[PDB]
């Protein structure tokens, strides 16, 4: 089950790939039925420009995400 | 699953947040209230395209379901 | 309500119009709509989809 | 009410504007709660390339639509 | 509101349909079945980018919620 | 199921992987995933979102 796998990842580092050219890596805090997720200590990666940004904590919207990858 | 998204938004009510769109537009503003659907009421909001402030809003409504992310500032 | 508002869409599209109604899903009815293309197009009476609606704010 | 206005348009011509650079004009047949709509005798307009295409009938997905305009 | 979308898809089961993505990719295939959520099972499907056939599928599953449109052929 | 499949996403992204599970909303679990970028990247175990999933088909 997709959502059971995601649930196993709480407190651990997650790698997220958007349909746009952006990736996020952070610590999964929790998520809702729609897989809107909350991440802590996040690195945002712009995969075209190469630009990186840090975030203490964020609600990452699930609509534009392609993949969530346990690990980083 | 739980209500971590709504918990996060409640935790940051009255604070400044960064809201990014997948287009690359950024909003920085004060979160006044939300509803259970992640519709957001913002105050004192600045809009940035390519790092240039492009507009300001005393009050704006933002549809949280349609943004890329809301980040604590 | 009955106020002129501006709206932006997930695509980047921007419009302006008078709010006449709305529903729980954030669909709106706007009258006298104008889309900023520095040109503009008048669209009249429109239904705005909450599915692509990002921002709603008073005029200016 | 948005959905009551759309309901008034059934059997009549509707103009639809997508978030992408595409527009559709056709006869509204019906729609569901999510405003996925069915159109008849449709003209598809690519607003960049200027290319036009005809359709006898189509289910036009509501997720990417910005506006529906009664008339054409 | 009604179930006009599902009625339309049922009406075209066993026929060829054109499925467009907002990206501009087109699929032409035979609609075998659907579920109530507009998930589609396709047979004998051709994929076109820029008018060039780019692939074929004996069987494909297509998520109707994520396409631009399904058009009767 | 346990078959290798290919998948395409609303963004244009394309991947390949072994189906291990899925749910009513069309989220999938895939193992041994590879994204076609003519290069490729190996991604291992992934959860695919039904929210951007367009196409699923057998290998080839």
Author numbering:
A (entry chain A), D (entry chain A): 6 to 77
B (entry chain B), E (entry chain B): 1 to 73
C (entry chain C), F (entry chain C): 32 to 68, 78 to 100
From the manuscript:
Sm and Sm-like (Lsm) proteins have been found in all three kingdoms of life: bacteria, archaea and eukaryotes. They are essential parts of ribonucleoprotein (RNP) complexes and are actively involved in various steps of RNA metabolism including pre-mRNA splicing, mRNA degradation, telomere replication, histone formation and translational control. Members of this protein family are characterized by two closely spaced, conserved Sm motifs 1 and 2, which adopt a conserved Sm fold that consists of an N-terminal α helix followed by a twisted five-stranded β sheet. A common characteristic of Sm/Lsm proteins is their tendency to form a hepta- or hexameric ring structure.
